[PDB]
Amino acid sequence: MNTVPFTSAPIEVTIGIDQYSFNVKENQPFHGIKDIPIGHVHVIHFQHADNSSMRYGYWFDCRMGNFYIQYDPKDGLYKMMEERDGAKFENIVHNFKERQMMVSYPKIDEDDTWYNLTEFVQMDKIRKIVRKDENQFSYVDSSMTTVQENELSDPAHSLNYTVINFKSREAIRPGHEMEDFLDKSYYLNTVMLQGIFKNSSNYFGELQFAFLNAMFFGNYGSSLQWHAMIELICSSATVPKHMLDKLDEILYYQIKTLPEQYSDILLNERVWNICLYSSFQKNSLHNTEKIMENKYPELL
Amino acid sequence: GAMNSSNYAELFNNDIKLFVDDTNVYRVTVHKTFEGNVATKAINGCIFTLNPKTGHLFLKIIHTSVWAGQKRLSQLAKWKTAEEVSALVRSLPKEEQPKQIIVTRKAMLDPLEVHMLDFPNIAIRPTELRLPFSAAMSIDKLSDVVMKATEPQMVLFNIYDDWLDRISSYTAFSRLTLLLRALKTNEESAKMILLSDPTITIKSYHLWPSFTDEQWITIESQMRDLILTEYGRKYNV
Numbered sequence: 028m029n030t031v032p033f034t035s036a037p038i039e040v041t042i043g044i045d046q047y048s049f050n051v052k053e054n055q056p057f058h059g060i061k062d063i064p065i066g067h068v069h070v071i072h073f074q075h076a077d078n079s080s081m082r083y084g085y086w087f088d089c090r091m092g093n094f095y096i097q098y099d100p101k102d103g104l105y106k107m108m109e110e111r112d113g114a115k116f117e118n119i120v121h122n123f124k125e126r127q128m129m130v131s132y133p134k135i136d137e138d139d140t141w142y143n144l145t146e147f148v149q150m151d152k153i154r155k156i157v158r159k160d161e162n163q164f165s166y167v168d169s170s171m172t173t174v175q176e177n178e179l180s181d182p183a184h185s186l187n188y189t190v191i192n193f194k195s196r197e198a199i200r201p202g203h204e205m206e207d208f209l210d211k212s213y214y215l216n217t218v219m220l221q222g223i224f225k226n227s228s229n230y231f232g233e234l235q236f237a238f239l240n241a242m243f244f245g246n247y248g249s250s251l252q253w254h255a256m257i258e259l260i261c262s263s264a265t266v267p268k269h270m271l272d273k274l275d276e277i278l279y280y281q282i283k284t285l286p287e288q289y290s291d292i293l294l295n296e297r298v299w300n301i302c303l304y305s306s307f308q309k310n311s312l313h314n315t316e317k318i319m320e321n322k323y324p325e326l327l
Numbered sequence: 328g329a330m331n332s333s334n335y336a337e338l339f340n341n342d343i344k345l346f347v348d349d350t351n352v353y354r355v356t357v358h359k360t361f362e363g364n365v366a367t368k369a370i371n372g373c374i375f376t377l378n379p380k381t382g383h384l385f386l387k388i389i390h391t392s393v394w395a396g397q398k399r400l401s402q403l404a405k406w407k408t409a410e411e412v413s414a415l416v417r418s419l420p421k422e423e424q425p426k427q428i429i430v431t432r433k434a435m436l437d438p439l440e441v442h443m444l445d446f447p448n449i450a451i452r453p454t455e456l457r458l459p460f461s462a463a464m465s466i467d468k469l470s471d472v473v474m475k476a477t478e479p480q481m482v483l484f485n486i487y488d489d490w491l492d493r494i495s496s497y498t499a500f501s502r503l504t505l506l507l508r509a510l511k512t513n514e515e516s517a518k519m520i521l522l523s524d525p526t527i528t529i530k531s532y533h534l535w536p537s538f539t540d541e542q543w544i545t546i547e548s549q550m551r552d553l554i555l556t557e558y559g560r561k562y563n564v
């Protein structure tokens with residue numbers, strides 16, 4: 028069980044850790060989050076009470092270092108940092124555990140939600156999408172644009188998701204135009220899976236990361252990426268059975284977790300109706316179809 | 328974006344462009360079988376690819392053999408159209424290739440865009456104009472070459488004959504669309520108007536009769552009367 032200590036909380040803020048959140052008042056004696064499950068990536072995120080513009084946060088894995096949050100009054104945000112002095116960090120984390128100035132990661136024992144949303148998400152792949160190699164953790168916010176969005180502006184602050192474009196030479200073999208456009212299996216299996224991602228685990232990891240950035244930060248380019256990766260699978264007539272079954276589980280837990288009130292803006296009507304009712308895989312996503320129809324029958 | 332009445336003179340500027348109409352690519356006759364079911368029999372079709380500035384018509388004849396053993400022919404026909412337009416463009420010298428292709432039916436956009444990925448600078452556009460190019464098969468010489476084809480074939484025509492020696496492209500296109508609209512609304516009457524006077528003939532190298540400027544004005548009036556007549560017959564007005 029790992030800990031992220033906080034030097035203070037000088038401004039009122041809603042703090043998120045994974046799917047949990049809590050309000051901290053200005054100058055409230057808050058000194059961090061304990062009992063964080065080892066074995067998963069995690070995301071600690073922020074929304075200031077006085078400007079809900081810019082949700083921002085940090086993806087991290089406590090196995091890779093000792094991390095803390097400190098407010099920067101010049102840049103005006105809570106920053107993640109890495110403490111290299113292990114003794115000092117353990118000493119500080121103990122003092123606070125003793126003074127009970129930390130909230131506890133509130134994981135119910137039955138509850139596999141976070142695992143189910145991050146099953147294929149690996150910190151090493153996050154760090155290739157979010158490029159800042161001097162840190163072991165990765166900053167994301169509401170406003171960051173994707174490489175594909177930049178093509179259609181600061182590259183250092185971009186989300187380097189894998190570019191998917193259904194009307195591109197990469198997606199369409201010369202001489203197989205109609206075939207490849209109407210059945211995207213060659214783009215999915217040869218170009219993307221064998222060529223770029225190497226395996227379906229890496230593909231799902233990027234899909235899951237894109238959803239979580241869409242949900243936690245309202246990051247629009249991330250939402251576009253999540254839907255494109257869904258649509259590429261659903262628009263392929265030949266998909267391994269284990270991938271379809273896993274995709275159904277992945278999407279089920281995503282739809283389950285999505286705030287009911289944010290469905291209007293985070294769910295693309297065209298993609299979902301196509302995927303569930305028109306696509307090659309329209310009968311292969313039973314769990315997802317059932318939860319969608321019972322939770323969001325309007326969208327459909 | 329889309330082509331409409333606001334940007335109509337764009338058709339006659341000096342940027343090479345082509346209209347593509349796919350409405351006569353996949354043509355069938357529907358008939359009863361011996362068992363009393365219904366079946367279709369394909370007949371030869373054509374892509375109508377037209378430069379509205381010069382009158383040059385690239386008529387790609389679609390022979391029924393291209394459908395043999397294929398499924399979902401109405402979908403395939405849009406992709407076959409796109410394949411043939413892409414091949415046409417690739418066959419042209421660079422300075423003759425179009426800068427824009429305007430499709431008359433929006434279902435052609437994705438097929439054509441996908442076939443033209445090698446040409447990122449050629450704009451593929453829809454139009455809000457309702458153009459009567461489906462009536463091209465009412466032009467006798469075009470219908471004849473299509474129905475007589477025994478294999479795929481490309482035939483080149485100038486659909487304006489020699490009109491551009493006397494009138495502008497804008498006026499030539501307006502005459503062409505008036506004639507085709509009339510032929511689409513009442514083909515028998517339209518063809519009667521065009522041929523009722525045997526002293527005016529169609530040159531061997533032409534599609535339409537050799538009307539004088541004054542005769543064209545009369546013909547054009549009779550075509551507007553025909554279109555208004557049919558509009559009244561139709562809607563009871």
Ligand SMILES: CC[C@@H](CN)c1ccccc1
Nearest residue numbers: 032033034095110116119
């Ligand atoms: C252990 C790192 C120091 C700041 N360098 C600190 C102080 C208080 C709380 C958390 C972290």
